[PDB]
Each structure stands twice: as C-alpha cells, then as structure tokens.
A paper describes a structure:
The major regulator of virulence factors in [name] is the transcription activator [name], a member of the Crp/Fnr family of regulators. PrfAWT is a homodimer in which each monomer consists of an N-terminal domain (residues 1 to 108) and a C-terminal DNA-binding domain (residues 138 to 237) linked by a long α-helix (αC, residues 109 to 137). Two α-helices in the C-terminal domain, αE (residues 170 to 178) and αF (residues 183 to 197), constitute the two helices of the typical HTH motif present in many prokaryotic transcription factors. Glutathione binding stabilizes the DNA-binding helix-turn-helix (HTH) motif in a conformation compatible with DNA-binding, thereby allowing expression of [name]-regulated virulence factors.
All the previously identified [name]* mutants, i.e., PrfAG145S, PrfAG145C, and PrfAL140F, could grow in this medium with G-6-P, as could the [name] mutants PrfAL140H and PrfAA218G, whereas the strain carrying the PrfAA94V mutation was unable to grow. The PrfAG145S, PrfAG145C, and PrfAL140F mutants showed the highest expression levels, followed by PrfAA218G and PrfAL140H. To gain a deeper understanding of the [name]* mutant proteins, the crystal structures of purified PrfAL140H, PrfAL140F, and PrfAA218G were determined as individual proteins and in complex with the [name] hly promoter DNA. We expected that the crystal structures of PrfAL140H, PrfAL140F, and PrfAA218G would be similar to the PrfAG145S structure, since our in vivo characterization classified them as [name]* mutations. However, their structures showed that each of the [name]* variants had only one folded HTH motif, with the remaining structure residing in the PrfAWT conformation. Consequently, we suggest that these mutant structures represent an intermediately activated form of the protein with features characteristic of both inactive and activated [name]. The most striking structural difference between the inactive, intermediate-active, and fully active structures is the position of their recognition helices. When superimposed on monomer B, the recognition helix in monomer A is shifted up to 6 Å.
Numbering used by the authors:
A (entry chain B): 2 to 237
B (entry chain A): 2 to 175, 183 to 237
The structure:
C-alpha cells in the first residue's frame, strides 16, 4: 500500500516509532482518559465493548495497514467506550496522541487525506455490512466476511481458494459477521460445508463456490470493488 | 451549532452558495459519474440504495447541519451506489465537487477538522447502532433511533417530551415487524399521541434498550444530551 508506506515514513521522520503488541493485548482501552490515533501497520485487531456485566461485544475487525482513532480530532474526547484488542499473534502499530496528530496532519495534507479516506472506508463498510444483513440475514453477513477474507488472504490450491490465516477459528468468523452465539453460527457454517461452498481440510478453510459468496454478500462485494479494485480484480 | 455556521460563512465567503431542494428530490444519486460533498445545512434526508429487484433500502438518516460525501476525497470515486433523498418538505444544502473541496479544506484546516470529525461521528453512530441491535435486536434499534429523535427534536412540556416535528415526517420515519414494535411502544405509553402531537412519556424505556446509542449522543452531543438527563 503506497499511501500507507508514505505515511509510515512520515511518522518515523517525525520521531514516532513502531510498537510491537502480542495477542490479546489492548492497543488502547475504554478506561484511558487519554485518546490516541492508532496507525495499525501490521496484524489483525478487533474493536470491543466490555459492558458492565463483563460481556465482550465484538464490533469491528481491522488489518494493517489502517487507522483507528479513539477520540474526536477536534474535541480529543472519546468517540465511544471501545478497546482495540490484538487477535493475531503479533501486531505492529504507531500510537499517537490526538493533539500530536493534528500538528502532523497539518504539516502534510497528503497524509491528512490518507487518514480521511480510511474513515470513509469505515462508514461505507458498516453500511454495506448492514445492507447485506438486511437482505440475506446472518447468511449474508457470513458470506460477506468470508468473501472479503478470500480476496485478501486467498491463494490458489487444488482444493479451492485457501484462506491463508493461522487460527481462523470458526468463532472468529461469526463475530465480524455480527453473531455472538456459536450455535447459530455453527448452523450456517455447517450448511456451507454440506453444500460444498467451503471446506475445512487440514488447518485452513478452502473456498470452492466463490460465486456463492458473491451472491449473498453483494453489497460488501460492491464495497470492496469500489474501495480495493486491484485486489478485487484478482478473483473476478 | 456554531461550528457549522463558521463553515457556512466560510463556504459563502468563498463564493459557494446553497441550493434549495424539496421532498422526494435527490441531492445526489447512484448513477451520476461526478461525486460531491454535500453540506446539509438544514432539513432531513435519508441515504438509499437499490438491489437488483427495484427495492429501496433506507440505510441512514441525516439532519442539517451535517456533511455527506458520495466519493472518496483522494480518488474522487464512489464510496457506494447511494442516493441522498430529501425527507423534509424543504432542505438547504451546499453541493461541492470533491476536487474543489480539497483546495478549500487545504486553505483553512479548522474546517477540514470539522469535516473530518463529522466522518468520525458517522462511524461511531453505525457501531453503536450495531451494538444495540446485537444486544436487543430490532427492539434496540427502534429505541435507540427514537431516542436520538427525542434528544434532537424534543422539548419538555406538561405532556412529556414533545417531538417538534411534522406528523408527516414522523410517519415517513416510522416493514411489518417494525410497525408492530413501534405500535407496541405506543400501546405501552412510551410515546403517546395527543393534541395533534406526539409526546415521549417513558424516556427511561428508550434509554434502557438503546444504551450504546445513548452513550454515542452523550459523547457526540453532550450539550443536547444534558437538556434531558
Ligand atoms: Na480510551
Ligand atoms: Na454518486
């Protein structure tokens, strides 16, 4: 990603260093009175909301490169009581305080625009997710996430398009789709297996009917088409 | 809202003037090859999409002041095949081309931040709406959504929190399963009709089932939030 690399160089130029986080660590948390701008350069994370009764809600998933900000750029106050938890084994992020961000993005407008469009990708992603769910329910959400994962991490193998992710637990799949119950997800994931849309052969998932996923996750497909056309065109 | 006034003054002081749109008109549409930055100064609108059936899908509602951009600021291409339809009888909006927008934001970064932070609020709104739905399903979405409408348009009266909105625009804003959830709220005296108006009489019920959108409004609009808490 060119825009993400040039932004990386820009941060290091201005002294900001990368920080290594291991699985289950929180890059930022919902109790910190200080808010940050996280430039997730490598790895996978998820946005959570730990309610008072201890229940963890999974709201969004991110992979580097991307930008996740915990506070409003103007007021510097919380946009929501969320945490950014690492779910890959390791992750690499640049932690920035918001006040420092405004200064940096004011010296270079090109990178300001890079951060600006990451928020736009978020807005349209959520709506797209909500669109597919409204049409095809949980099936649309699951097919949508699997499709996106196939665009990003898919590779050609004799047994279909292999999703090249370590520890892609079937429960990790049911959260980005918007389901907290492992049984209701197990139902759809099994049906997909029975209809041979996917196959779990040795460690990883294999997509076999890619057209099937495009059929029930159309708006998330149109989102990836409009947002990442180069990667989209690899399997279209 | 002072932040929007300065932006208006800023847009006008640089020549950009507003247009007037009318109910059922599209400020932008999913077929135009040119993308725009809409500065919705007044009125109420909805974002719509269309699947390959001719079906209309209501995705999002916006009230002025606010900003709705149809294309990415860097590439200027679509973010999604969306239309911006006017819900209110009339609406006032400034229609800017993304290319023209940039050179404008580049010369007064204070108003760039206003637009930036406006995307932040839209992002957080979607997550809170999704959070409530994941906890209380359609019930949680309806409540959350009525809760915000109460915070924005409500005023305390002897009959409760009156929604100072056209009874027309109200019904335009309120599917069979949804119609029965709303009517059940009416039947249970959460929101009540009286004297040609609607009043919210059990605000706590809405807060109870729209908690994460209730926090969103407190974090995004703490001024208005305090008027009723
Ligand atoms: Na925080
Ligand atoms: Na458009």
């Amino acid at each position: 990603n060119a825009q993400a690399e040039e932004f990386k160089k820009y941060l290091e130029t201005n002294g900001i260093k990368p920080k290594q986080f291991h699985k289950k660590e929180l890059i930022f948390n919902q109790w910190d009175p200080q808010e940050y701008c996280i430039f997730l350069y490598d790895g996978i994370t998820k946005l959570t909301s730990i309610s008072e009764n201890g229940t963890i809600m999974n709201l969004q998933y991110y992979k580097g490169a991307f930008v996740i900000m915990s506070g409003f750029i103007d007021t510097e106050t919380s946009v929501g009581y969320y945490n950014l938890e690492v779910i890959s084994e390791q992750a690499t992020a640049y932690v920035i305080k918001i006040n420092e961000l405004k200064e940096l993005l004011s010296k270079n407008l090109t990178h300001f625009f890079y951060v600006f469009q990451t928020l736009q990708k978020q807005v349209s992603y959520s709506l797209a997710k909500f669109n597919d769910f409204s049409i095809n329910g949980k099936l649309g959400s699951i097919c949508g996430q699997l499709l996106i994962l196939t665009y990003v991490y898919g590779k050609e193998t004799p047994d279909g398009i292999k999703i090249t992710l370590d520890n892609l637990t079937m429960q990790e799949l049911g959260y980005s789709s918007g389901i907290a119950h492992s049984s209701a997800v197990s139902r759809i994931i099994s049906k997909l297996k029975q209809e041979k849309v996917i196959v779990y052969k040795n460690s990883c998932f294999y997509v076999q009917n890619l057209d099937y996923l495009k059929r029930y996750g159309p708006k998330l497909d149109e989102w990836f088409y409009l947002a990442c056309p180069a990667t989209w065109g690899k399997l279209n």
